[PDB]
Design a binder for this molecule. Structure first.
Ligand SMILES: CCC1=C(C)/C(=C/C2=NC(=C\c3[nH]c(/C=C4\NC(=O)[C@H](C)[C@H]4CC)c(C)c3CCC(=O)O)/C(CCC(=O)O)=C2C)NC1=O
Ligand SMILES: CCC1=C(C)/C(=C/C2=NC(=C\c3[nH]c(/C=C4\NC(=O)[C@H](C)[C@H]4CC)c(C)c3CCC(=O)O)/C(CCC(=O)O)=C2C)NC1=O
Ligand SMILES: CCC1=C(C)/C(=C/C2=NC(=C\c3[nH]c(/C=C4\NC(=O)[C@H](C)[C@H]4CC)c(C)c3CCC(=O)O)/C(CCC(=O)O)=C2C)NC1=O
Ligand SMILES: CCC1=C(C)/C(=C/C2=NC(=C\c3[nH]c(/C=C4\NC(=O)[C@H](C)[C@H]4CC)c(C)c3CCC(=O)O)/C(CCC(=O)O)=C2C)NC1=O
Ligand SMILES: CCC1=C(C)/C(=C/C2=NC(=C\c3[nH]c(/C=C4\NC(=O)[C@H](C)[C@H]4CC)c(C)c3CCC(=O)O)/C(CCC(=O)O)=C2C)NC1=O
Ligand SMILES: CCC1=C(C)/C(=C/C2=NC(=C\c3[nH]c(/C=C4\NC(=O)[C@H](C)[C@H]4CC)c(C)c3CCC(=O)O)/C(CCC(=O)O)=C2C)NC1=O
Ligand SMILES: CCC1=C(C)/C(=C/C2=NC(=C\c3[nH]c(/C=C4\NC(=O)[C@H](C)[C@H]4CC)c(C)c3CCC(=O)O)/C(CCC(=O)O)=C2C)NC1=O
Lengths: 92, 173, 160, 161, 160, 160, 161, 160, 161, 161, 161
């Protein structure tokens, strides 16, 4: 259902990224970042644009930002575009 | 995979008992040959290209039909440059994984990452399995010519290639 | 370094370094002064090592400096010797951080494309690093040769 | 990421130089403190949950931010913030082992202020919770390792402010 | 095992073991003898370790053996001492393997789920493991006790 | 809210609300009056509900208020009663919303993480909620108590 | 998204308050009009295609924007704009059922002016088409439901202008 | 079916049915009796509904039965009335199921492809369905006709 | 998946028939028991963890399968099997609400015996644990709902054997 | 097994129909080619051993599969494979006489790929030997009968691949 | 992407016009030079590696950017930049065949300056390498095709500056 159901260390499920997003959240970010591949010179695959601007769901923004930081990318701007701030009920 | 220490510890965990002197002797056996196992690994890393060139030449000298047209039977041999490169790639595969196995003191890496599914792939591609084992034990002899009088290193080298040869084989007898 | 490799493989799984990784770091950090002297020795003798490895590489491949080779001409030979110096410097960095990471990030990855771009044959490059290992082992101890050889063999395998 | 060894090797390599006496000085300096660093990292891995619990208890546990209207009122927000504090502690430990805060720049501080500003997370309370965690961590690991860890704690707080 | 983990981490990248990994395997096989000695000492003093750890746990956590507690009664106390013996055995395995792979693959993955399904407080198990750690480190030398508690600390961290 | 959840579930499919969803919204707005009445009764009897639930909890779980327990002392007992009041308020919210969205978005997502970080046994909170459920259902009619315990049961299931 | 009930509960919860007499006032107000809202939503779901057809026919069809050079000249553009009008009608119906325009802010108006400006879509003609749709919709659903729907239609037009 | 759809939507999220979904299932099983009554009335007046809808269609769309039209001739007109009977039966199914799943899974998915492959104008089928809707709603009460036309409107929207 | 209503509608539709008196008989039968079904499903959702705990305690908790060598010795295996029992209970609840075991065929029993045989999981012990869970569940929900739930429990056990 | 006549009669009987003009069309088609079919079957029965010998000689006789390590290395394996080829030829002749490949489905192809995969028999070499047998058989029986026989040879090869 | 033919057809279609004499003028102009364009594209495909090698040798091969500290020092960076030059040559060839630089706008220049600025790639050196490639390419393909190719080379350089 949601990512914060008690799973941590010593769980049966492997350790992973845990979003705090309420289930079926509809909050969304708008992010701009650069992510060079750093593996294209031994796989020899075609290039792609690495400069991206896109909307990312709130329930996936944390795992996305951590993946971007893992692979040497730089994050240039972040904006919450959809959803309120510090709203108790009503993020779904 | 499992090295020898892991497999001994797993055998003892299966009955839920602590390590006694028998398993400890088994572990000491590995700890006393570890350094020469590392010497063999370094030798293999120093001579990999030359060893595989020699093995391929000695294989193709006695199996000349491997370099000729497939015959109508669409057999995957080392006929053209494409197939030739693929076969040399496989020889490097065998050398690398048996070097891993020599360092681990065990053959579990072999049957998990090499043997499982190998014969299905070769049968679907129609790759010769006889000459494939032939080149493996050719590689074994070429490596053993570096350490000859030191018999313990001879057996330590003989282990992985002989496992591969006996497992790729069919059981005529 | 080895510390960086341990930290990276621990961070990719969202965990602290285990016991074995911590003792990897410990054992490496206790080896520091030995490596830090060995690179002193090797930096002392670079002007000699390069000089002898260069005559070896052209006794093996005299057609490289012959009329029509890639290194025929004063300007080209000077820069092959410069490449010798750069690779010896990279080897000092690799001996310092006790594993292949400098030799891989600089050097190995993308090297074949660069040399095919320039016109230097790759088999000549492999043989040149071999002659470099030859020249360096000829002028250092046996224990030091034991400590330095695997770094050369990593380059030889990374080019081929 | 680059540790102290990687940084020294890079400074030497970016000039075509061999590692001279100053590089040896820095390398010896790192090699002498490595064992203390490993000890501190082990001890911190041992007591992460208690460190976070005590820092939260001394910094923001009974303030008004945990009451209705506060940033961390509901259970979702409480869990999210304790996860954030765990992140900060783990990355400070990585930086202390490496002897170089570049991992904090690449994996933590990059775009963190902007995320917190878009979410509405109070920055001052976060910096104060990190300061309280610095106290407990230095307490648990002793003076030298506590100064080492506090270096990277203050680095995170400066990058966040 | 350190050898196994080095082999997998090198296998994913499709490369042979670099000289750093081989160096570390060498250092491990060289220390295997004192590893076996330490495992000896911890192994054959198991009765005192479990007994004295059970005492320190029951004095620190009287609720678990209080009337109705999870380990209340003769059978439940025996079962809890059985669990402590399990974890001491796993620690000996990890000491001989040179890494927490045996401890973590057996007894740590999914331990929270199991102990929650059984109704046992995981903090009590952590307390018992800490008490056993103190008792066991009391019987070792300085460096040996440091290296042995290295695994008890990991088991405690995983069991938070 | 039922209306909100129907709207999102219809929004993902890019369609208007079908006549079934509109039927259910209609039935909800028609029952809103007795929903408000039940919320009234539960809301304004909060003191007795929290008090009698705290009693049944402390008699069923004497360890939490025993010397050293998590809720040991005047302040800790007051804080635990505060938590029970929190959950009663959330149950009233859920009763008026017609669905557990208010209860689950506030107080259930990440509750295990919070209570583990605080050192509180989650089973004690579940016991307190069950005791409050019995006390609160004692003050309602048959059908009203059935519909009101419908939410206490969900809160207990989420808090296992 | 939050409806009227969610908004009242949030206003009460953000102060640590129980639902007092004013919250009951608003909640009763929503509960009294819910049945009319359901009736209007059903009727609008019944006649969406005809509403869009009639609004387009009365607002912009035989004008210069549908001729060569006009925005929606080609068949791609005509289909795209009628799909846009369908979006507006469906989301206005959602907002009318919920009694709260927050869904329009989160799912419709967020970054819409910028998209239209980058594409070159005329904003005035769009607002005019939405106004014509408001006429037909109020016509079909009667006075009270038409006032309710026109609230959110005007909300969309103000967010677009 | 409403029960089926609630179960799948709860199954994807790996959770039990929340009290809102159970509330809605309860309201559905409580209204099942008038659902069966309405299905009765629509079911057993099928002849008049199909006949009078066919008339209104043929007067509104004389081209389909004009010389050469798709439904031109005795057999083609009979087949078109057969199709109208199909859709009336599906509407009764949907009325008893409480949701358009029966109508949409049978007769709506891929209807445009089928009618394009047959050469039939889909707008004529929509006109026939609208005429049948008026005829059928004429025989029901106010609230019953409102709830019954709820499905004819969905069938018309899907058949644009 | 198809529930009782879907099955009746399918049986009627596969013959080109309208819903006649027998279909009405079955539909009334389901509609009369729906409220009891909802009550039982709520109660089972309330006490799933305790049901699984008690079934495991009475069926296989102290047997030899939990000792070294047994099929659920290590902590991984214990957690995996309690997760399996949770699956069985949840899907039996779904089947009881639907009044039709087709969901069990589509989502549970399809290829389960083969998976257990490849893994080496003992089938008899699993069937006995499901039987013990049937006892506790019928106990908690009363006689009628217990017979309803036991229908699908026995369905799972027959599909597994 | 069902031949062309049986298949036509079954298609007519499964609809409660009498044999109409299309059935007569198919029946006449079979009756016209029956005599050619009998001629081909006789000729193939005459020369089965030589057909198999020539196909084996042209397809896999001198390849590496007959050498040590190959599939048909020892005498047991050589005899087994020539027996397999005899099976294929005989069943293709049956199918050609019947004018229907259902006998191949029932008596040959059912579970053949699985048997060959469990034994380790190379499928590609088998398909190539069957293709070589198709050449010789069409050669010996002439063009029309060769196309008829090649239909069922290709049926076997497609069922094996 | 749109070529010369697509651009003419679009200009005519955006006015509801039939292709008049000016469109015929442009279309004939493209059709007359198409064969020269095909010849040049073939010759450039023949010698791409040598063109890039010679341009790099004449432009930046021995400068300070290839030494330590320079952008393209390590082997990764050298390979990356030669791949970039290959991209530029291939897309210039596409643009020359199409007779329209819109493919360069859509697939090359869109967000290229920003990527290079974030990476730290020197723009002036890149423009000079493209200019050197223009020399060699015009050299190899002759005067007319060289002017055609230089049009799109200068287009890329202007879009990059
Ligand atoms: C690795 C570096 C890194 C960090 C630190 C990080 C933080 C981060 N913190 C978040 C939320 C949050 N962070 C907090 C934290 C706090 N509230 C307070 O009052 C305190 C001052 C503070 C804790 C000390 C809270 C309450 C939220 C939830 C916001 C919400 O639910 O609206 C989110 C939104 C994701 C989600 O929970 O769904 C991210 C991505 N991401 C990263 O990649
Ligand atoms: C199809 C249009 C297109 C282009 C051109 C493109 C370029 C592009 N060039 C890159 C890097 C690069 N580009 C260069 C290029 C140069 N260095 C110099 O000194 C020279 C002046 C110049 C070559 C003439 C270098 C060195 C890098 C590597 C940067 C790094 O590793 O940090 C990267 C980062 C991706 C990666 O390598 O992982 C992209 C995406 N992408 C595109 O989609
Ligand atoms: C049709 C495309 C095609 C070609 C040409 C090809 C050649 C090819 N030449 C080979 C060897 C060889 N080829 C040659 C010689 C020569 N080769 C020449 O083209 C020259 C005429 C001559 C040198 C003057 C020699 C001496 C060997 C032995 C390999 C060695 O021991 O180095 C081999 C390795 C196996 C063998 O010894 O037969 C291949 C696969 N493969 C192909 O798919
Ligand atoms: C609206 C949803 C929500 C909840 C539930 C919530 C809980 C919550 N419980 C707390 C403490 C606490 N809660 C308890 C509770 C208990 N002790 C026991 O033994 C029992 C099992 C249990 C009572 C039934 C205790 C003792 C503390 C204080 C812990 C401490 O300070 O050491 C605290 C820290 C101090 C504070 O109250 O501000 C929070 C934030 N916050 C929320 O936003
Ligand atoms: C849910 C909220 C929402 C909206 C409204 C939305 C609009 C939206 N309108 C678009 C295009 C368009 N929109 C129009 C609309 C109009 N032309 C006119 O002259 C009229 C004034 C107007 C209709 C009333 C046209 C013609 C295009 C096509 C633009 C083109 O093909 O260049 C596109 C480009 C996507 C595409 O068609 O490929 C988006 C994303 N997206 C959203 O997420
Ligand atoms: C090798 C890794 C491993 C572990 C650890 C393990 C634990 C394990 N602990 C168990 C029980 C138990 N464990 C305890 C333990 C405790 N009670 C307390 O209060 C203390 C906190 C704690 C002792 C320190 C108790 C009381 C039971 C019996 C519970 C019952 O039957 O109700 C059981 C069920 C019965 C049995 O022992 O077979 C298992 C399988 N199994 C494994 O394979
Ligand atoms: C650290 C990784 C790395 C390498 C290797 C590197 C090489 C490099 N080699 C160069 C030249 C060169 N290097 C060689 C090398 C050789 N010829 C032979 O026959 C031998 C096999 C070999 C000497 C051992 C030659 C021939 C040239 C010049 C070729 C030309 O003039 O185009 C230049 C241009 C020098 C300048 O701009 O001032 C660089 C940058 N750069 C790097 O960053």
């Amino acid at each position: 259902a949601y990512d914060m159901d008690g799973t941590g260390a010593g769980s049966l499920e492997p350790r992973g990224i845990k979003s705090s997003a309420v289930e079926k959240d509809s909050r969304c970010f708008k992010v701009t970042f650069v992510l060079p591949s750093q593996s294209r010179l031994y796989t020899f695959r075609e290039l792609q644009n690495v400069y991206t601007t896109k909307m990312v769901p709130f329930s996936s923004w944390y795992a996305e930002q951590q993946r971007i930081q893992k692979m040497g990318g730089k994050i240039l701007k972040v904006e919450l575009v959809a959803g309120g701030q510090m709203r108790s009920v009503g993020n779904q | 995979m499992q090295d020898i220490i892991t497999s001994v510890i797993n055998q003892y965990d299966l009955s839920g008992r602590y390590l006694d002197i028998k398993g400890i002797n088994q572990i000491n056996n590995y700890f006393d040959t570890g350094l020469k196992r590392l010497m063999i690994a370094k030798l293999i890393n120093k001579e990999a290209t030359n060893l595989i060139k020699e093995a391929s030449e000695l294989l193709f000298i006695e199996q000349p039909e491997l370099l000729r047209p497939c015959g109508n039977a669409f057999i995957g041999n080392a006929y053209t440059t494409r197939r030739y490169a693929a076969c040399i790639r496989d020889i490097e595969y065998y050398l690398r994984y048996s070097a891993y196995s020599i360092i681990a003191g065990n053959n579990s890496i072999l049957d998990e990452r090499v043997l499982d599914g190998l014969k299905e792939t070769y049968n679907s591609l129609l790759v010769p399995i006889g000459p494939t084992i032939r080149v493996i034990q050719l590689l074994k002899e070429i490596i053993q010519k570096k350490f000859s009088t030191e018999n313990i290193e001879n057996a330590i080298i003989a282990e992985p290639f002989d496992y591969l040869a006996i497992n790729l084989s069919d059981k005529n007898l | 370094s080895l510390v960086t490799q341990v930290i990276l493989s621990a961070d990719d799984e969202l965990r602290y370094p285990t016991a074995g990784e911590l003792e990897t770091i410990s054992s490496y950090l206790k080896t520091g002064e030995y490596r830090i002297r060995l690179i002193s020795i090797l930096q002392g003798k670079e002007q000699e090592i390069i000089r002898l490895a260069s005559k070896k590489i052209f006794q093996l491949h005299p057609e490289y400096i012959a009329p029509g080779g890639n290194a025929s001409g004063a300007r080209q030979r000077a820069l092959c010797l410069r490449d010798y110096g750069w690779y010896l410097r990279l080897i000092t960095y690799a001996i310092l951080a006790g594993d292949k990471e400098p030799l891989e990030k600089i050097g190995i990855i993308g090297v074949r494309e660069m040399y095919n771009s320039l016109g230097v044959p790759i088999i000549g490059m492999i043989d040149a690093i071999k002659c470099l290992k030859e020249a360096t082992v000829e002028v250092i101890s046996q224990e030091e040769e034991d400590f330095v050889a695997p770094y050369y063999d990593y380059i030889i395998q990374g080019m081929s | 990421m680059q540790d102290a060894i990687t940084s020294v090797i890079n400074a030497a390599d970016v000039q075509g130089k061999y590692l001279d006496a100053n590089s040896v000085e820095k390398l010896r300096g790192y090699f002498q403190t490595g064992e203390l660093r490993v000890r501190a990292a082990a001890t911190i891995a041992a007591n992460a949950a208690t460190i976070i619990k005590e820092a939260v208890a001394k910094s923001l546990l009974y303030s008004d931010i945990t009451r209705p209207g506060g940033n961390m009122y509901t259970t979702r927000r409480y869990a999210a913030c304790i996860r954030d504090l765990d992140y900060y502690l783990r990355y400070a430990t990585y930086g202390m082992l490496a002897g170089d805060p570049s991992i904090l720049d690449e994996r933590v501080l990059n775009g963190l202020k902007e995320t917190y500003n878009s979410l509405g997370v109070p920055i001052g309370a976060t910096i104060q919770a990190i300061q309280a965690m610095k106290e407990v961590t230095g307490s648990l690991v002793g003076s030298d390792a506590g100064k080492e860890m506090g270096l990277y704690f203050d680095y995170i707080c400066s990058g966040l402010s | 095992s350190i050898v196994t983990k080095s082999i997998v981490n090198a296998d994913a990248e499709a490369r042979y073991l670099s000289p750093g990994e081989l160096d570390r395997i060498k250092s491990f096989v060289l220390s295997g003898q004192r590893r076996l000695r330490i495992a000896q000492t911890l192994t054959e003093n198991r009765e005192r370790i479990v007994k004295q750890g059970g005492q320190q746990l029951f004095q620190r956590r009287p609720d678990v053996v209080s009337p109705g507690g999870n380990a209340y009664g003769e059978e439940m106390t025996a079962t809890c001492l059985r669990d402590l013996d399990y974890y001491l055995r796993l620690v000996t395995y990890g000491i001989i393997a040179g890494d927490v792979t045996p401890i973590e693959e057996i007894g740590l993955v999914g331990v929270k789920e199991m102990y929650s399904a059984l109704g046992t407080p995981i903090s009590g198990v952590a307390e018992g493991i800490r008490c056993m750690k103190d008792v066991a480190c009391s019987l070792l030398s300085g460096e040996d006790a440091a290296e042995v508690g290295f695994y008890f600390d990991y088991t405690l961290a995983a069991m938070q």
